[PDB]
């Protein structure tokens, strides 16, 4: 509710990153028909999203023009993509964008070079555009790199406000703290029983072990690269 009902999002050039951890992330709440027009997820099917556990969930929200939503996709290049916000090609997350035309925003349009993915460039250094290395705040060839969007309410789709929230989640590879709501049952040992350990699925004889783990480790693997030893939650 603080990332969707906030009514005040950050500027694109200054996308705030919020960490979500140690809770239950039921995605069924954000399925309203009127918002969430685009739900393009990369690497995870939108239907199979609730029944998965994630360990690194970060939510960055910003307001950009609706015509520039295309640039947010990985691999695309543009003024927003190259100078304001960049996403890696190997991206695993869902980009939800909804129109907010009914409901000051600064975007950077001048930069020496395109930024690496997941970087913030919040600085008011004057971008020179001439032979003269002017350090003044303003000048003929000296231009400020930040300007307000000044969204036009009359405009229908072009140059319209468009809130964008990105949920970059890392797939389960470590002790996870965010997972969907699923009932937990009592473990059964020394019996061939189907199990579901933090999203991992399979069948086997669950037995105790004398192996010693480490605080940053959660799964053991064998020569065949299969989940051999798993420490149960709770």
């Amino acid at each position, epitope marked *: 509710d603080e990332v969707f009902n906030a009514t005040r999002f950050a500027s694109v050039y200054a996308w705030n990153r919020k960490r979500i951890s140690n809770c239950v992330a039921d995605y069924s709440v954000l399925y309203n028909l009127a918002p969430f027009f685009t739900f393009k997820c990369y690497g995870v099917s939108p239907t199979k999203l609730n029944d998965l556990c994630f360990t690194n969930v970060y939510a960055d929200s910003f307001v950009i023009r609706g015509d520039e939503v295309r640039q947010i996709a990985p691999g695309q290049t543009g003024n927003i993509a190259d100078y304001n916000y960049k996403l890696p090609d190997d991206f695993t997350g869902c980009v939800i964008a909804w129109n907010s035309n009914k409901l000051n925003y600064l975007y950077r349009l001048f930069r020496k070079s395109n930024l690496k993915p997941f970087e913030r460039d919040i600085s008011t250094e004057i971008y020179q555009a001439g032979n003269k290395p002017c350090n003044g*705040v303003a000048g003929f060839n000296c231009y400020f790199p930040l300007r307000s969007y000044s969204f036009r309410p009359t405009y229908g789709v072009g140059h319209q406000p468009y809130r964008v929230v990105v949920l970059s989640f890392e797939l389960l590879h470590a002790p996870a703290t965010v997972c969907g709501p699923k009932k937990s049952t009592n473990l059964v040992k020394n019996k061939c029983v189907n199990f579901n350990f933090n999203g991992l699925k399979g069948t086997g004889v669950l037995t105790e072990s004398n192996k010693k783990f480490l605080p940053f480790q959660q799964f053991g693997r064998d020569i065949a690269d299969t989940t051999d030893a798993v420490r149960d939650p709770q």
Partner: antibody, heavy 114, light 98 residues
């Protein structure tokens, strides 16, 4: 639309170039003098970003330029007009600063009408 | 300051500068009854709407405006102007003759 508006050595005529269509305070409107039978010559230069102003270095002090956002003009003031200085003056708009790289403001464009 | 004098007086026009301008030039076409228009930016580019027949090449102290086949209704004057440093100085000026 950059619509704009003598023999005696001493004059104080005011030259103003009205602006239409494009939005003022976004580029660098400049004034260029073109004597008949000869080429162009930049004489005046304004700045949207700041109040810094550069004139032609052929003669200093005589050239003066100003800005006015409400009426979208420059209102160039000319004092002690030379007999040979008589020419058909042009008001030109600078290219979009979003281009960046090489000097956008120094690059003339449109060159007014008439 | 910066001074130029275009050497000319498939038409190629070259304006030479004393100092190393390094691609800070513009090529301007002025119709006899109209205001001058933009043809080449950054000494090598084409503005929107300009026909592709015009072309600008060269950098440093050598530049060339090449118009291929001498397309008609192009008798207007051609000017060479630099943006390297103030003051803004135009070239000598040359119009194609037929």
């Amino acid at each position: 639309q950059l619509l704009e508006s003598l023999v005696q050595p001493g004059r104080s005529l005011r030259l103003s170039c009205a602006a239409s269509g494009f939005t003022f305070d976004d580029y660098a409107m400049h004034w260029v003098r073109q004597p008949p039978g000869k080429g162009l010559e930049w004489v005046s230069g304004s700045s949207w970003n700041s109040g810094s102003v550069v004139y032609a270095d052929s003669v200093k002090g005589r050239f003066t330029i100003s800005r006015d956002s409400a009426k979208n003009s420059l209102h160039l003031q000319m004092n002690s007009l030379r007999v040979e200085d008589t020419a058909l003056y042009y008001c030109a708009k600078a290219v979009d600063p979003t281009r960046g790289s090489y000097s956008p403001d120094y690059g003339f464009d449109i060159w007014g009408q008439g | 300051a910066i001074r130029m004098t275009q050497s000319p007086s498939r038409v190629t026009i070259t304006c030479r500068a004393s100092q190393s301008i390094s691609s800070y030039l513009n090529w301007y076409q002025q119709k006899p009854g109209k205001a001058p228009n933009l043809l080449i930016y950054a000494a090598s580019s084409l503005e929107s709407g300009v026909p592709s027949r015009f072309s600008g090449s060269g950098s440093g102290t050598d530049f060339t405006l090449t118009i291929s086949s001498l397309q008609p209704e192009d008798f207007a004057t051609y000017y060479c102007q630099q943006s390297y440093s103030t003051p803004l100085t135009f070239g000598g000026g040359t119009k194609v003759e037929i």
